[PDB]
Amino acid sequence: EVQLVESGGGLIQPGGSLRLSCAASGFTVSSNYMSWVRQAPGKGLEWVSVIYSGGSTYYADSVKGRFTISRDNSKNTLYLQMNSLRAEDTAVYYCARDLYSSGGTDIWGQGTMVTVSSASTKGPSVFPLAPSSKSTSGGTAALGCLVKDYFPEPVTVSWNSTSGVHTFPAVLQSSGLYSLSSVVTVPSSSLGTQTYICNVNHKPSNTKVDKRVEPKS
Amino acid sequence: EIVLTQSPGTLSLSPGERATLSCRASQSVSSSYLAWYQQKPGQAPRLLIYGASSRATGIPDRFSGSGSGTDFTLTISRLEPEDFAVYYCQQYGSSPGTFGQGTKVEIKRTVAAPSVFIFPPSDEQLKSGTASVVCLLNNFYPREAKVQWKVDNALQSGNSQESVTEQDSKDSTYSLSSTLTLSKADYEKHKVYACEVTHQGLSSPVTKSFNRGE
């Protein structure tokens, strides 16, 4: 395998600083063109910074003078140290290995969401979407968890620690907090027997909530 | 900087069809230094093609690229349902490298009406002073659907929000959640809570409802 494993991210206050890193396998950061690329919500891909094997660095106009791309050869790691962050820096950030000085990117990190906001972290409240006749369709039934009032994104939802699952995109409410539903379709014959538990992980708040979802008449 | 203009902006085609995506450059791109990427929702981009026409290792044979000068093309020779994504071109023949704005490929299928479910608020939530009522439209196509809430037969406005899933990677359907948010007090003052759904797969609109307390 050839890969980049990214670390860092999350909520940061405007004016603050934040560092991202990526560990490479199957190539050496010291001998490659490496870059960071970002993508604001709903928008396209924009290069942030590039570093050459010989050490030269280049920056997008929007970040020049306040972001630094760097590397640790003996740890095979790439870094992005950001400063003077603003709301317009909110984006998913990816590290990348480039085949050419100006792009051609074969290896991408998985991405991490950086949210620049003065609002406080808030953990989700998790409420059951209980199965009933009104959520039953013959041999199948729907049940879920409402994951309400959290900030920032993302939240992770798993079931019983996998099929039939629809976790919906979060919506931003007027309060400025996010809300999401996760639903699963299960055999209607199991509603009385099988325990269904949604596991909600909101890393920015270090909140982990398991909620058992039980039927209603 | 070289500007890359992708067309069309959105492309909807059925499995088995040929898809042709264009990327036009504002000036000539040197050495066919152009790449194509696929980006699925929530994921990092995946390199498909580099050098305008070289398929990356491990990429299925249905993906191919061509072009030179100012016009480049990505072809999916026979679309598969898993191919919905945004596809981006990128030039690296002149500095700085630049990306197109993406073409969103959506997979067409035959019409599928939603199954409609409704969930009353939890007792746990009501103890907190708010009531969320959830209407689920499951596994439907096309994506356009009208969802209206009625409380004691009164059409609601300004108190609901919707979310739609990405297409299913096997059967190309969508699901949609609509959440009506009311105060506990308002919720307890009314009896009938109804979600009315209009969709092309239905012969007539469908209403799903419950009476508070059940």
Domains of chain A: 3-116 (2.60.40.10), 125-213 (2.60.40.10)
The full length of chain A comes to 217
Domain-ending residue, one of B89, B107, B125: B107
- Domain final residue pick, B45, B79, B107: B107
Residue B164 CB coordination number (10 Å)? 17
Residue of B92, B132, B208 with shortest CB distance to A146: B132
3-state secondary structure chain B: CCCEEEECCEEEECCCCCEEEEEEEEEEEHHHCEEEEEECCCCCCEEEEECCCEECCCCCCCEEEEEEEEEEEEEECCCCHHHCEEEEEEECCCCCCEECCCEEEEECCCCECCEEEEECCCHHHHCCCEEEEEEEEEEEECCCCEEEEEECCEECCCCEEEEECCCCCCCCCEEEEEEEEEEHHHHHHCCEEEEEEECCCCCCCEEEEEECCC
- Among partner residues B43, B47, B125, which is closest to A127 by beta-carbon distance? B125
Contact between A47 and A60 (Cβ < 8 Å)? yes
CB neighbours (10 Å) of residue B205?
A: 11
In chain B, the number of structural domains is 2
Put simply, the answer to whether B175 touches A99 (Cβ < 8 Å) is no
Residue A134 sits at φ, ψ, to 5 deg, of -75, -5
Same domain, yes or no: B100 and B176: no
Kindly state whether residues B85 and B102 are assigned to the same domain.
yes
B93 in contact with A at a CB cutoff of 8 Å?
Answer: yes
What's the gap in Å between the CA of B121 and the closest CA on chain A? Answer: 8
> Which domain-ending residue is among B91, B107, B123?
B107
**B96 touches A47 (CB < 8 A):** yes
B207 lies within 8 A of chain A by CB: no
| CA distance linking residue B55 with residue A106, whole number of Å | 11
B12 and B103 together in one domain: yes
- In terms of phi and psi (left: phi > 0; alpha: psi -120 to 50; beta: otherwise), the region of A189 is alpha
- Candidates A58, A135, A181; nearest CB to B177: A181
Q: Which of A2, A47, A129 to mutate to test the interface with B (most CBs of B within 10 A)?
A: A129
Question: Rounded to an integer, what distance in angstroms lies between the CA atom of residue A95 and that of residue A78?
Answer: 8
**What resolution in Å is listed for this PDB structure?**
1.4
Q: Are residues B196 and B172 in the same domain?
A: yes
Full 3-state SS string of A76-137: CEEEEEECCCCHHHCEEEEEEEEEECCEEEEEECCCEEEEECCCCCECCEEEEECCCHHHEE
Nearest to B130 by CA among A175, A136, A200: A175
Phi, then psi, of B185 in degrees rounded to 5 = -60, -50
> Which is nearest to B173 in space by CA: B51, B88, B84?
B84
Range of the domain at B177: 115-211
B77 touches chain A (CB under 8 A): no
Residue A65 burial (C-beta neighbours within 10 Å; 0-12, 13-18, 19+): exposed
Pick from B96, B161, B175: CB nearest A166: B175
Residues of B in contact with A166 (CB under 8 A): 138, 165, 175
What count of other Cβ atoms lies within 10 Å of the Cβ of residue B19? 20
